[PDB]
Amino acid sequence: YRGNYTDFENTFQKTVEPVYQMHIKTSKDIAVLRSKEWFQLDDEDFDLLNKTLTFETETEVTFKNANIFSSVKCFGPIKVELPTKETVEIGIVDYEAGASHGNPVVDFLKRNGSTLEQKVNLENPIPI
Amino acid sequence: IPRETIPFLHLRKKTPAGDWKYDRQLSSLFLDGLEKAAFNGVTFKDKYV
Amino acid sequence: LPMSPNHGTFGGDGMYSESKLSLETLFNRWHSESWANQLTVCGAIIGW
Amino acid sequence: PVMADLNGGLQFVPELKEFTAKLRKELVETSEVRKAVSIETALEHKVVNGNSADAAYAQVEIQPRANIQLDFPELKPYKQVKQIAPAELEGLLDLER
């Protein structure tokens, strides 16, 4: 819709994020994850070492202005891969902020994770 | 010096076997010397180093 | 003589250890040669 | 000949090489962990607050400029400068001499 719109009470942005993966290889990776108050395991004493966590997150954002969010809210299950490849829920993301300039959960998962599928470019585009 | 305890600073005596073992008597002279030095101090008057 | 307790224990010190070990010959050489009146030997195994 | 051990009992520690390597590795892992957790809480904080709630922390510093004085003598109050001289001095000297 072309125009001048200032009705920021009605704006929102309910995203379903791409599934992010982390291979937890070191003890440093475990200590970084535990630092994040949003990483809320059902069992606090779960052994994360040499586990593949998957993050199935939804990000609900309301606005105050065009530049800052009034309310951020990333949530959704944290799944571990079993030795049978069958993922089972072992925790939840449960982030919930007010006035923010971004969503740290997805940013944190982008830098430290992977999307299950990587676009690999050819050396040179082939004209079809 | 506790019996059957080697102090942190100790001298050693060469054994007839040829090997240097802790000696309590020498290590006493040494440590009494250090205690005297630590209280009264030690002079090096007329010593060329 | 500045002596060491560690003879090749840590490693990567070039010829430090065969320098400091070889000074320990002077403890026998004092009885065996003819300088025992001019020099006395006082090894100090210097710690950490 | 006198052999003195000033080693501080360090000879009674077995495998001193392995033992000191272990102590360094147990400090380095602990320092490196906390650095990686500090870097991730600094990035989280950056993302959530952008650089708008991080601009309030930065303060203006005053760098000095040379202010070259002529170092004139510091004149005391008359009471302080009446003490150093005897009372009899006042009106004794010919100040043209």
Question: Are A79 and A53 spatial neighbours (Cβ–Cβ below 8 Å)?
Answer: yes
Chain A partners within 8 Å of D49 (Cβ): 100-101
Chain D partners within 8 Å of C5 (Cβ): 5, 7, 10-11
Strands A74-80 and A88-94: antiparallel
| CB of C41 less than 8 A from some CB of D | yes
Q: Which of D47, D49, D52, D54 to mutate to test the interface with A (most CBs of A within 10 A)?
A: D47
| CB of C9 less than 8 A from some CB of D | yes
Dist. CA D16–CA D23, nearest whole Å: 10
Question: Are A95 and A72 spatial neighbours (Cβ–Cβ below 8 Å)?
Answer: yes
* Collapsed DSSP state (helix, strand, coil) of residue A16: strand
Burial level of B23, CB count in 10 A (0-12/13-18/19+)? middle
DSSP assignment, residue A18? P
Dist. CA A110–CA A112, nearest whole Å: 6
| Torsion sign (Cα): D4, D9, D12, D18 | negative
CA distances from A121 to A21, A115, A118, A125 (A): 21, 16, 10, 8
Dist. CA D48–CA A62, nearest whole Å: 14
Solved with: cryo-EM
Question: To one decimal place, what's the resolution in Å?
Answer: 2.9
The tokens 């101090």 sit on which residue? B41
Q: What is the CATH class of A4-118? A: mainly beta
With an 8 Å CB cutoff and a minimum of 3 pairs, decide whether chains A and B touch. no
| CB of A49 less than 8 A from some CB of D | no
Q: How many residues are given for chain C?
A: 48
Neighbours of A6 (CB within 10 A): 8
Structure tokens at C44: 């100090």
Closest CA to A96 of A68, A42, A58, A43: A58
